[PDB]
Design a binder for this molecule. Structure first.
Ligand code: IPT
Ligand code: IPT
Ligand code: MG
Ligand code: MG
Ligand code: MG
Ligand code: NA
Ligand code: NA
Ligand code: NA
Ligand code: NA
Ligand code: NA
Ligand code: NA
Lengths: 1015, 211, 174
């Protein structure tokens, strides 16, 4: 009947024989064990080695499998995703469903995972009480068997499914069989932009509860106006036989001190004309001066719920961590404990490059430490309820959480086709209701979300109200259907820009500043997704934060997103490499769009993370004369683990430094007067750098952790001294094909046919492998490309504009190449035009002045046709023969920085190995630029001026021709790109041009100058 | 919901109709045990949504009702909002859980008296005149049920009408009810007689309360 | 599957294969007929004489009934309540449920009405288009079979349940 019913193609059947959802249980039989949160003997893990067999369809599963193991099956670790063991391929698709859109139907070829386990059950567990099995995560649907007998069925991949096995089990050996279906009607609500996988991917466990049991409990905390008083209210539900002698004690603990306790018999207050709940009791505990929970100070209490007899025999105890905090929206502001939040958020998928969508404590802890260390205070569970340990860690470490229902129907046309359909209301309702029933006691959850990208339908409005009715303590948000619908308490747009309107019909993305003040609008605005961090991205990130700080009702947002969803594959030699969409034969796919992280899949930071850390700082600074003004953006804590280090340097050379403890009240100010700084001995720019250091380790950071920084220009003494006149005069030699210049052991060669410096010699060793030529292009970033593909051109994408205009194929045509001998120099004058099909795109005019001291001064003046798309860069490039170990520069760094992503960089003297000057983006592109550079050192070479540069073993050509970083090969020598000017990288989104007007190279005429010499 | 012809006749003859979902859980303890339970939300939703899908084009229907005597549960709030979203053209009413809950646009008590308060715990039945002016209250009051016409009854009916006429926000009510639910049985001679609860061996029964 | 699933003791299954709800349809193929609200050839009443047999529980229903009329069954008028034909007793209770309060379960002694109709379908309905059956009111739950084959299931006594019969019907008697 099971195969005959096809329950996985009916949205009306989301489960069979599944038990009610509830908060985390352990059924302790000792109260002290409950208090300390130690392991429970009534909660067994069934994780470990299971038996697994793969089938193309449920019809192909043999009946023998129900009662007996298949010998052809393998032994695999559980939890796992079976794509990660190689049984079939993981599919990466973004919007388009991985199956034909034909609800409620799925393909007849429906990959089926047959899991089974043979395990021991002790006699004591069956003598009395209730033994249940808990599947925390099964993707995407399953039938369960115990000892050959059918138990039940569950859907929704992201919430626990629980079954009573009491009547199915025997003492000694038992066998579970689970038939897991890759595709179901549930898949239509699981269209999140991620790898599509399947299997038993979260923990499996057995829970023993007594017959008379705590079946549910809700904890609420309410406060007086100034939070000096709280009432903890705990509603407790029981199952089993109702009895006069039954009691609940709820006790509240701070460490080993009991702070409050309440005891009551069962029997709620009258509810309606038929009475009240005889099977429920509400306990109310008074707490004076509660220590409040926030992301700043995650104060937690322990609530122990004891079900016992009147004379104190314990039946069982459950427990949870309690954080005293109030979340409310008032006068258009989201308040925590009465104070307006600024959300420094990030969206985080559950992703591991080796394990797929299986999460472990270590990876979770790693993510949380990195987040807090980079000034994040909030996380959005994009886009499903998480592994239950996540919330426990967020409670304890202190992160604000948006808990989000497992509903995404992005690929529907229109997006709300299912969510506006009352037929799909039952399936949707279970994804919302069972989330709330599970997570409602976690203090870290401050906001409920109705899902992701499912348009706006009537089912949303219904479930919005359900949550508001059941849980008043938390605002409900939902972005679908225009980000400001009747189903959301918070205007929560995705990728809405700061100043620029995007007036799409029906669902416009207004500039966030404009959106707030639309007629009749009062709500707070917190972006559910912004600053799409796909590859070389986060350009314009500072613009968001300036706006968040200026506007009270702009209360921040969640970056998209935390971690690249790349997967490890192995080459012929067994060496690992990072793969994205299409690398598993999966088709259709959405290529590198699965990689949008601030960190690589192994949690190595992208350069963008530091820009985020800097902009999300909790201390703000102003300078006036000798006085630094420090403002705290902490809402609750004093700066009791912070000291300010200051340093003044002259063009990278330390002059003076000091330390001053920070004593700033939440949202307060502190003035620090610098001592009189000794005036510089020489010419140049004085720079002041300040950093906030944390002297002590915390739960989330090490001793010496830097949390904030800032830089200013102080005095500048412009150099007025003339370089000592040398006695040598460079000698010009002329042939039909070359101008050559000689001075001592140095030689320069200008090709008269090309008009470029084709070679330089020190002693008589060649310095160049490729001539020094103008460059107006870059290996396109993910932001340049967008959604454009070879077979489906997006003519609006920056890369396609550059291609169509001939930028990548335009050839230099020489206009002029002359040499003159001066009194103490040789002057080479050149002029080139870059043309495409009769159209002149660029003109470059240069002088090279080689003087008697060996220095070559290069002056460059470029004209850019006003009607050509603005170029990616204006600079020079060449392949140096030298491969040197270190790169030394006076400029912005140390990390990669671009004109619209450089606020985090500091001006100083930096020295790194050559390899650090390359950013290993999985999809290769222009990378590793450093801006505001006055001096660059590489081997014997020095370049001076005011320029941006990158330097690596990879040419711009190889970068743009290679689709995976592991396929890159170091070229002979070193490719140097020195830019006078470089376009912004953008990143407001990665599917439409997002580089702001002020960062586009639109000025028409450009000037820069460089001095090249040997140091 | 009624036989489909009922709405046709109400359109054509002229009667205002309250169209009501097939949901009553009166015998539960407490009355909201099922309606506050998310497991019962799907079953409940279909009784509401399929009624609206069927009857939404009938001009005679002026008000939607979420059902009868089922306490007040979260499921009621969810479905109240579903209708408000899907059909803005009609107010939604529901009496359960005290007649003035978050699931009703209309204060719609049953058997609330004109001048006399009945201060039952949790679900008091205030005098209808007093109910209107309770702190914060602004809604119209129309009794979903009043003047229980059981046998020799309708004593004090004029008292309601005087109050309805004097107070703008007292906008009337629905008498309980139209027609005796008596069934015809036949005696030894084949003579017909009117029967009520218990006359079919049905037990437990509620005797003449069906009339 | 029908006796095994016990769909009538599961609030998660309120229907199987039921069509979407909608406002009154008659599928006129003439605009003037639609305007005047005159009868439609595409809307047929199945009211009249049907065959009926009473059982104390669904388990007591013989499988032969799916394919063949029970000889012991009576000819009764439909629409009707079977209590009004005296097959069992109508119950009057006010507040207290007529069954033991134990959701989602009902009594194992569950009075069961087996209804059947042998009827003819016009030839043109089988070549083209969609033929649905509409039960405006079935109290309180029901399974449907057409020509021996299972069609669907429905709940809610007071709203129409509609089922597509296009793949189940044949020329001649059904
Ligand atoms: C127009 C499409 C690119 S939608 C866009 O795709 C992104 C790709 O990372 C994310 O999934 C966003 O959530 C989504 O809005
Ligand atoms: C207090 C009980 C009698 S409830 C009372 O019973 C009446 C009997 O005719 C009606 O059914 C009412 O709707 C109901 O409120
Ligand atoms: Mg299903
Ligand atoms: Mg999406
Ligand atoms: Mg059912
Ligand atoms: Na703000
Ligand atoms: Na593709
Ligand atoms: Na993505
Ligand atoms: Na590339
Ligand atoms: Na009036
Ligand atoms: Na009655």
């Amino acid at each position: 009947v099971v195969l005959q019913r096809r329950d996985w193609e009916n949205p009306g059947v989301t489960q069979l024989n599944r038990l009610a959802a509830h908060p985390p249980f352990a059924s302790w039989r000792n109260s002290e064990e409950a208090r300390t949160d130690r392991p429970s003997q009534q909660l067994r893990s069934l994780n470990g080695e299971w038996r697994f067999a793969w089938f193309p369809a449920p019809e192909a599963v043999p009946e023998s499998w129900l009662e007996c193991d298949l010998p052809e099956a393998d032994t695999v670790v559980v939890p796992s995703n079976w794509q990660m063991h190689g049984y079939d391929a993981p599919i990466y698709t973004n919007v388009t469903y991985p199956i034909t859109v034909n609800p409620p139907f799925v393909p007849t070829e429906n990959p089926t995972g047959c899991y089974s386990l043979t395990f021991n059950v002790d006699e004591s567990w069956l003598q009395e009480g209730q033994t249940r099995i808990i599947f925390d995560g099964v993707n995407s649907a399953f039938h369960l068997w115990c000892n050959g007998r059918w138990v039940g069925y569950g859907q929704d991949s992201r919430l626990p499914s629980e079954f009573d096995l009491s009547a199915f089990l025997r003492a000694g050996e038992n066998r579970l069989a689970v038939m897991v279906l890759r595709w179901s009607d549930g898949s239509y609500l699981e269209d999140q932009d991620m790898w599509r996988m399947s299997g038993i991917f979260r923990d499996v466990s057995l829970l023993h509860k007594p017959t008379t049991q705590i079946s549910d409990f809700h904890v609420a905390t309410r406060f007086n106006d100034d939070f000096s008083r709280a009432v903890l209210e705990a509603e407790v539900q029981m199952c089993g036989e109702l009895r006069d002698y039954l009691r609940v004690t709820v006790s509240l603990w701070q460490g080993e001190t009991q702070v409050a306790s309440g005891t009551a018999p069962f029997g709620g207050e009258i509810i309606d004309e038929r009475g009240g709940y005889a099977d429920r009791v509400t306990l109310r505990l008074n707490v004076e001066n509660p220590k409040l929970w926030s992301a700043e100070i995650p104060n937690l209490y322990r609530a122990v719920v004891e079900l016992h007899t009147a004379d104190g025999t314990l039946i069982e105890a459950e427990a949870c961590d309690v954080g005293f905090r109030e979340v409310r929206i008032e006068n258009g502001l989201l308040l925590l404990n009465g104070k307006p939040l600024l959300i420094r958020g990030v969206n985080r998928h559950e992703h591991h490059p080796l394990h797929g969508q299986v999460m472990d404590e270590q990876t979770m802890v790693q993510d949380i430490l990195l987040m807090k260390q980079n000034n994040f205070n909030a996380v959005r569970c994009s886009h499903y309820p998480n592994h239950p340990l996540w919330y426990t860690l967020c409670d304890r470490y202190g992160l604000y959480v948006v808990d989000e229902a497992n509903i995404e129907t992005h690929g529907m046309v229109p997006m709300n086709r299912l969510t506006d359909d009352p037929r799909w209301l039952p399936a949707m309702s279970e994804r919302v209701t069972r989330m709330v029933q599970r997570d409602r006691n976690h203090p870290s959850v401050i906001i409920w979300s109705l899902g992701s990208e499912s348009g706006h339908g009537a089912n949303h409005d219904a479930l919005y109200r359900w949550i508001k009715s059941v849980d008043p303590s938390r605002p409900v948000q939902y972005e679908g259907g225009g980000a400001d619908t009747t189903a959301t308490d918070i205007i929560c747009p995705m990728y809405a820009r700061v100043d620029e309107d995007q007036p799409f019909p029906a669902v416009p993305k207004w500039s966030i500043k404009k959106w707030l003040s639309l007629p009749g609008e009062t709500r707070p605005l917190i972006l559910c997704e912004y600053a799409h961090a796909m590859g070389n991205s986060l350009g314009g990130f500072a613009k968001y934060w300036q706006a968040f700080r200026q506007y009270p009702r702009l209360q921040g947002g969640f970056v998209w997103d935390w971690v690249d969803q790349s997967l490890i594959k192995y080459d012929e030699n067994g060496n690992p490499w990072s793969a994205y969409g299409g690398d598993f034969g999966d088709t259709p796919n959405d290529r590198q769009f699965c990689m949008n992280g601030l960190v690589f899949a192994d949690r190595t930071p992208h350069p963008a993370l530091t820009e985020a850390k800097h902009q999300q700082q909790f201390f703000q600074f102003r300078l006036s004369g000798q006085t630094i003004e420090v403002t705290s953006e902490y809402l609750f804590r004093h700066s009791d683990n912070e000291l300010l280090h200051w340093m003044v340097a002259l063009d990278g050379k330390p002059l003076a430094s000091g330390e001053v403890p920070l004593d700033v009240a939440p949202q307060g100010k502190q003035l620090i007067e610098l001592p009189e700084l000794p005036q510089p001995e020489s010419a140049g720019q004085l720079w002041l750098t300040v950093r906030v250091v944390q002297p002590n380790a915390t739960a989330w950071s090490e001793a010496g952790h830097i949390s904030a920084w800032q830089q200013w220009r102080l005095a500048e003494n412009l150099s007025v001294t003339l370089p000592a006149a040398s006695h040598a005069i460079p000698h010009l030699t002329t042939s039909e094909m070359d101008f050559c210049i000689e001075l001592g052991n140095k030689r320069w060669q200008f090709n008269r046919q090309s008009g470029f410096l084709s070679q330089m010699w020190i002693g008589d060793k060649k310095q160049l492998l490729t001539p020094l030529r103008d460059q107006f292009t870059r290996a396109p970033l993910d932001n340049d490309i967008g959604v454009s593909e070879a077979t489906r051109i997006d003519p609006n994408a920056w890369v396609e504009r550059w291609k169509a205009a001939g930028h990548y194929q335009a050839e230099a045509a020489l206009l002029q190449c002359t040499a003159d001998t001066l009194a103490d120099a040789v002057l080479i004058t050149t002029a080139h035009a870059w043309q495409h099909q009769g159209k002149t795109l660029f003109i470059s005019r240069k002088t090279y002045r080689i003087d008697g001291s060996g220095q070559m001064a290069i002056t460059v003046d470029v004209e850019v046709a006003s009607d050509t798309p603005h170029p990616a860069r204006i600079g020079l490039n060449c392949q140096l023969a030298q491969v040197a170990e270190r790169v030394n520069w006076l400029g912005l760094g140390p990390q990669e920085n671009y004109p619209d992503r450089l606020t985090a960089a500091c001006f100083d003297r930096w020295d790194l190995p050559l390899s650090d000057m390359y950013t290993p983006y999985v999809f290769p592109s222009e990378n590793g630029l450093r801006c505001g550079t006055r001096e660059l050192n590489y081997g014997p070479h020095q370049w001076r001026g005011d320029f941006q540069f990158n330097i690596s073993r990879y040419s711009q050509q190889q970068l743009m021709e290679t689709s995976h970083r592991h396929l890159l090969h170091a070229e002979e020598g070193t490719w140097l790109n020195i830019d006078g000017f470089h376009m912004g990288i953008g990143g407001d989104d990665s599917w439409s041009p997002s580089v702001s007007a002020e960062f586009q190279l639109s000025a028409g005429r450009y000037h820069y100058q460089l001095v090249w010499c040997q140091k």
